[PDB]
Design an enzyme around this catalytic site. Structure first.
Site, PDB file in Angstrom:
ATOM      1  N   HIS A 187       1.529   4.013   7.986  1.00 53.46           N
ATOM      2  CA  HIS A 187       1.591   4.548   6.628  1.00 53.46           C
ATOM      3  C   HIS A 187       1.957   6.009   6.521  1.00 53.46           C
ATOM      4  O   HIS A 187       1.278   6.881   7.100  1.00 53.46           O
ATOM      5  CB  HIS A 187       0.252   4.335   5.928  1.00 53.46           C
ATOM      6  CG  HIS A 187      -0.194   2.917   5.933  1.00 53.46           C
ATOM      7  ND1 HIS A 187      -0.828   2.341   7.011  1.00 53.46           N
ATOM      8  CD2 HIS A 187      -0.108   1.955   4.984  1.00 53.46           C
ATOM      9  CE1 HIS A 187      -1.093   1.076   6.732  1.00 53.46           C
ATOM     10  NE2 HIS A 187      -0.672   0.823   5.508  1.00 53.46           N
ATOM     11  N   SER A 201       0.825  -1.195   0.000  1.00 56.27           N
ATOM     12  CA  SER A 201       0.000   0.000   0.000  1.00 56.27           C
ATOM     13  C   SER A 201       0.870   1.260   0.000  1.00 56.27           C
ATOM     14  O   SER A 201       0.524   2.244  -0.614  1.00 56.27           O
ATOM     15  CB  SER A 201      -0.983   0.016   1.145  1.00 56.27           C
ATOM     16  OG  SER A 201      -0.447   0.757   2.168  1.00 56.27           O
ATOM     17  N   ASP A 255      -1.730   7.066   8.953  1.00 56.07           N
ATOM     18  CA  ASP A 255      -1.876   6.358  10.210  1.00 56.07           C
ATOM     19  C   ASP A 255      -0.485   5.873  10.612  1.00 56.07           C
ATOM     20  O   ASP A 255       0.505   6.128   9.926  1.00 56.07           O
ATOM     21  CB  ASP A 255      -2.876   5.195  10.151  1.00 56.07           C
ATOM     22  CG  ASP A 255      -2.516   4.135   9.088  1.00 56.07           C
ATOM     23  OD1 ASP A 255      -1.408   3.575   9.121  1.00 56.07           O
ATOM     24  OD2 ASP A 255      -3.354   3.902   8.218  1.00 56.07           O
TER      25      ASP A 255
END
Ligand SMILES: *[C@@H]1O[C@H](CO)[C@@H](O[C@@H]2O[C@H](CO)[C@@H](O)[C@H](O)[C@H]2NC(C)=O)[C@H](O)[C@H]1NC(C)=O
Ligand SMILES: *[C@@H]1O[C@H](CO)[C@@H](O[C@@H]2O[C@H](CO)[C@@H](O)[C@H](O)[C@H]2NC(C)=O)[C@H](O)[C@H]1NC(C)=O
Ligand SMILES: *[C@@H]1O[C@H](CO)[C@@H](O)[C@H](O)[C@H]1NC(C)=O
Ligand SMILES: *[C@@H]1O[C@H](CO)[C@@H](O)[C@H](O)[C@H]1NC(C)=O
Ligand SMILES: *[C@@H]1O[C@H](CO)[C@@H](O)[C@H](O)[C@H]1NC(C)=O
Ligand SMILES: *[C@@H]1O[C@H](CO)[C@@H](O)[C@H](O)[C@H]1NC(C)=O
Ligand SMILES: *[C@@H]1O[C@H](CO)[C@@H](O)[C@H](O)[C@H]1NC(C)=O
Ligand SMILES: *[C@@H]1O[C@H](CO)[C@@H](O)[C@H](O)[C@H]1NC(C)=O
Ligand SMILES: *[C@@H]1O[C@H](CO)[C@@H](O)[C@H](O)[C@H]1NC(C)=O
Ligand SMILES: *[C@@H]1O[C@H](CO)[C@@H](O)[C@H](O)[C@H]1NC(C)=O
Ligand SMILES: *[C@@H]1O[C@H](CO)[C@@H](O)[C@H](O)[C@H]1NC(C)=O
Ligand SMILES: *[C@@H]1O[C@H](CO)[C@@H](O)[C@H](O)[C@H]1NC(C)=O
Ligand SMILES: [K+]
Ligand SMILES: [K+]
Lengths: 358, 358
Positions: free
Chosen positions: A311, A22, A308
């Site tokens: 990330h 991601s 977050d």
């Protein structure tokens, strides 16, 4: 003037490719509301490059083994990796509740070893389904699973009607085509495996019908608990194979890493893929990433994301920022931005590298 | 000023070792009358170095497989090879009169591949006897031989009394100790092998009793003649093994290349070992010697020796002359005598290498 080794991943020229998760998945933005790119360590300016294959929540190893699949696909002279975290001790995977994550960590290390070594010598990586034929009436069975993780490679084939134990010998034919080489798993339960009062020692062979090579694994562990599904990762040529089970359940590959387009030896670049320290990660990609075939890059800090906690990190953003420019020299110590003079001798170098001479 | 890549074998420092044949065998001089060093491509000034293991008439591959044995032994950071010629097409080796030298050339290539790759990562090479125990009353038998060449590794074990055919299964235990790793041969007759009206398909497995790994080869060739003894060269860890024969004659290792003292990756240097053109040589060491683990050196001329036609050549003398001095940079294109500036970029380099920048 200063030409130090810099802690980045980069590229000699435009001929490169990155495999990720991601933290480099440009497509994930559509599942952020509002739309926000900050979940990435990758610079979004690279989102239109056609040089990234990344998927939020996934990893090459995860995709190789489990139903939670993403068809990682890419081609490049220089290959870069920034994935792995989506199969870590944190996930606590074991085939069964009495199993061992340590076994799965060992598997992970062995897998990425083959991936890194081979992407130093092939341009192209993708996944291919491996067709197989089993002659019995028994079907495949999902015997290895934990949480939302369901193993599907290799497949297990259920016992036939007519057998009362697991001392049987059965086989399947599996066929490898479409690639120069293939990475496939050969796995067994390595341990004393209890079923209806009897203890089994799993045995699995693969056989290349034309080269005549037998690759086998037999269980040797004596422990009756805390054991699991040990895998080896074979690098095989195209051909027609048998999977010959001699005990317990027959296992056969269902997916392979498809390696294509042989290239001049070109070390891969691998970025440590870990969680914020609050979760358990591992160093298996570090173990897998060795000279001369791989350069390993890591930040000196805890992973503290801004989107977050897991990330969008300053340290990893910085490492990946090197993808925004060409750099001439790659070495164990880092990337040198200039090809003329330096104060250290580049080790295990690739590209146009500076002298540390007078 | 000129810093070209030079066509020599050399060394970064004193930590090197050379493996050779008569063209670097200082001891051979005592079998020349009168005493004459000219049979060597090596400079005799290196005769007192303790850095050479060479034997007239021999080669590492020759010693590995045959009764004509020399215990090649040496240790070095940088390893250099100048041998191979003493097993060439010229020798016309085949296990039997209906066999194939091409099979033996293929074997030679596969062997040296393992030797070169592994001496890039171990300091020490020697030979070790591999002890085995076979339980039957049958003894070893010299089934593979041609001229003065008698194969003795792997050993063949004769059929027991009591068996009338070659469809039997028998085994031996062989034990590997004293090394970090071992190169051993796993071989079969790959072909339809006629014995008393019946055609056999040789089958041989080795089994690591503790890792549980099965390494096997089964014959797949359909030809009934012009076939031979195909070998694979396994790189194995210490342990206790079974050699399990499933058809034809049981074969078991009797010698291993003993690899010791793991080192930082350090490419080997390999000098083409060929006869004067009047004899048939091969390019198998060239095929075996690939980047990043090996640099290959060859002269641009026919081998025309001054002592006799096959010993003491200007071109090879020149290549070996680099052993008389330290050199800072090793590359595919050659050895650079200076570590500062050049006009070509060193490829697959090792050491302190020059820049081709402004
Ligand atoms: C690997 O494991 C298999 C299955 O356990 C072994 O084959 C069995 O061996 C036992 C002898 O201990 C026999 O009772 C079975 O009949 C065999 N089953 C077969 C052939 O399907 C096999 O020998 C082991 N492989 C080795 C030791 O190389
Ligand atoms: C490798 O070759 C051996 C020996 O030919 C095969 O084992 C034999 O297989 C035939 C079946 O075609 C049987 O008739 C014999 O009883 C077997 N001999 C044994 C087990 O000692 C073996 O199956 C082949 N290995 C493969 C195909 O993986
Ligand atoms: C992955 O994508 C490649 C390239 O299109 C394709 O050849 C391959 O079949 C795909 N593999 C799958 C869907 O398993
Ligand atoms: C990466 O660096 C961090 C911070 O120094 C360290 O805690 C971590 O162990 C490193 N990871 C690996 C795989 O070496
Ligand atoms: C990985 O971690 C283990 C401890 O579990 C350690 O012994 C090993 O050296 C580490 N390797 C790397 C490359 O970080
Ligand atoms: C994206 O999220 C980051 C970190 O939470 C934050 O700085 C910013 O408010 C967001 N950006 C936009 C354009 O919403
Ligand atoms: C090396 O290159 C940089 C950028 O071109 C330049 O500023 C520096 O002076 C050069 N140094 C040399 C050629 O010694
Ligand atoms: C070769 O010499 C070495 C070093 O002395 C010794 O350990 C080894 O046993 C020898 N191998 C033989 C004689 O096969
Ligand atoms: C070495 O060079 C000679 C002369 O050019 C050539 O004939 C020979 O084929 C070369 N050998 C190999 C293995 O390339
Ligand atoms: C060796 O010789 C074969 C021809 O028999 C040739 O096709 C091959 O490219 C040669 N390889 C090298 C490395 O010289
Ligand atoms: C050694 O033999 C070489 C080549 O035949 C020759 O030049 C010379 O006469 C010999 N040298 C001595 C000292 O006998
Ligand atoms: C490189 O080194 C050689 C030998 O020291 C010297 O003659 C030459 O001038 C040097 N060139 C440089 C430093 O540019
Ligand atoms: K099995
Ligand atoms: K055999």
């Amino acid at each position: 003037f200063d030409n130090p080794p810099t802690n980045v991943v980069s590229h000699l020229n435009g001929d490169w490719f990155l495999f990720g998760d991601s933290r480099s998945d440009c497509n994930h933005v559509v599942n952020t509301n509002p739309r926000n790119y900050s979940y990435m360590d990758l610079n979004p300016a690279l989102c239109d490059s056609g040089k990234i294959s990344s998927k939020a929540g996934n990893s090459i190893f995860r995709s190789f083994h489990f139903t939670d699949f993403y068809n990682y696909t890419g081609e490049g002279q220089q290959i870069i990796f920034y994935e792995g975290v989506n199969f870590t001790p944190y996930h606590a995977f074991k085939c069964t509740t009495s199993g061992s994550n340590d076994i799965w960590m060992q598997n992970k290390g062995l897998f990425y070893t083959q991936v890194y070594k081979n992407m130093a010598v092939y341009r192209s990586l993708t996944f291919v389904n491996v067709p197989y034929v089993y002659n019995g009436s028994a079907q495949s069975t999902a015997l290895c699973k934990s949480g939302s993780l369901v193993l599907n490679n290799p497949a297990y084939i259920a016992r036939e009607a007519n057998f009362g134990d697991y001392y049987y010998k059965v086989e399947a034919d599996f066929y490898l085509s479409g690639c120069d080489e293939y990475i496939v798993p050969l796995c067994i339960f390595n341990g004393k495996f209890l079923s209806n009062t009897k203890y089994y020692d799993d045995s699995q062979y693969y056989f290349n019908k034309d080269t005549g090579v037998i690759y086998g694994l037999n269980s040797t562990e004596t422990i009756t608990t805390g054991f699991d599904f040990n895998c080896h990762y074979l690098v095989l040529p195209s051909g027609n194979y048998l999977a010959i089970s001699n005990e317990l359940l027959l296992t056969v590959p269902t997916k392979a890493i498809c390696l294509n387009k042989r290239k001049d030896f070109t070390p891969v670049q691998v970025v440590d893929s870990r969680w914020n320290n609050a979760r358990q990660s591992d160093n298996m990609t570090a173990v897998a990433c060795q000279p001369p075939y791989c350069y390993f890059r890591n930040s000196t800090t805890n992973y503290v994301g801004v989107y977050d906690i897991n990330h969008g990190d300053a340290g990893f953003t910085s490492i990946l920022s090197g993808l925004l420019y060409d750099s001439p020299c790659f070495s164990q110590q880092g990337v040198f931005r200039y090809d003329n003079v330096s104060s250290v001798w580049p080790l295990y170098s690739y590209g146009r590298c500076p002298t540390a001479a007078d």
